[PDB]
Curated annotation (Swiss-Prot), chain A:
Subunit structure: Monomer. Homodimer. Interacts with type III, type IV and type X collagens.
Motif Prevents secretion from ER: positions: 187-189
Protein name: Peptidyl-prolyl cis-trans isomerase FKBP14
Catalytic activity: [protein]-peptidylproline (omega=180) = [protein]-peptidylproline (omega=0)
Organism of provenance: Homo sapiens (Human)
Length: 189, 189
């Protein structure tokens, strides 16, 4: 358990949490940001953004390093305070209303989480022979290592059965493979 | 509001058979040589330092240079890449040590092995939806569901229920139906 550099305080949790944020997730948030020095408000989505919340992508340094460290494992309806030292904020030089070497205090409300499935990167990871289609063996191999990564035991019969059902559903033209197009475009109809 | 610079990747060698591709979180064992693009000078070689030990690098957590995270995804054991990394993705405007400011870097990197990353506190918290410091079967099922979906697989509940039992068979020891933080710590694999 590594030393946290941002102070995180959970102010409120939902009655029930169905999903927690992780790297790559888009987070719809309202927030207020204050300078710890004088308590002055530097930004509020409510006041400075026509009252609209904003989308933030977690875990890719889209914004402050402190947001990346402070907003993991968060649920819709959850509210968090972050106290962020300058090194994880705007550091020396600062920005806008934020002076150099400012510790920042955020009040952040999570309204929705989204993640877009089936990126090209995931396909390429699975396509071990780079032929732009996925074989049953390629899918089985991926499932095996993904389980084993987490130290989760692989029951081969359960996995073979899972693979068979995946292909029954996704292999639309029944050539035995899931092509790039069959991977990318999905319809239940 | 922001833009971005990119690494240039040139593949130098590919293995006849690729058994697994690198993905965020993996441990990569690599040899590398690093050069300044400016004058072509060698600043480091793993073949020369510490009696030729290759080095371990965790992909996708900014353990090292930004350009390494951008350039080493989807890589196979036996694959070699040349990364050309602009300063913003290397040691930046400041530079560091023997790397002068605003240095474009050239790395030739060979992948010797991929190993599973360790169980993290972060992963446990992400799964532990109700913050009771143990993972219910439903929480593990939820995690499986979202990860399956991310990779293009939406399958029948019977599959998830079966996979969860495989997992709990090993990880739930007192058989209270949960995987406590204690139980999660070591893959007893
Ligand atoms: Ca393939
Ligand atoms: Ca097909
Ligand atoms: Ca729990
Ligand atoms: Ca237990
Ligand atoms: Ca265990």
């Amino acid at each position: 358990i590594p030393e946290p550099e941002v102070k995180i305080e959970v102010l409120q949790k939902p009655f029930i949490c169905h999903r927690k944020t992780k790297g790559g997730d888009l987070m719809l948030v309202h927030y207020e940001g204050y300078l710890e020095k004088d308590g002055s408000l530097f930004h509020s989505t409510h006041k400075h953004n026509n009252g609209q919340p904003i989308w933030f992508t977690l875990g890719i340094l889209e914004a402050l390093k402190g947001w990346d460290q402070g907003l993991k494992g968060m649920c819709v309806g959850e509210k968090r305070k972050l106290i962020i030292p300058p090194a994880l904020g705007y550091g020396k030089e600062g920005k806008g209303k934020i002076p150099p070497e400012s510790t920042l205090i955020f009040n952040i409300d999570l309204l929705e989480i989204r993640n877009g499935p089936r990126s090209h990167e995931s396909f390429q990871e699975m396509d071990l022979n780079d032929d732009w289609k996925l074989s049953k063996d390629e899918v089985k191999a991926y499932l095996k290592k993904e389980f084993e990564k987490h130290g989760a035991v692989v029951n081969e019969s359960h996995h073979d059965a899972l693979v068979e059902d995946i292909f029954d559903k996704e292999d639309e033209d029944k050539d035995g493979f899931i092509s790039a197009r069959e991977f990318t475009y999905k319809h239940d109809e």
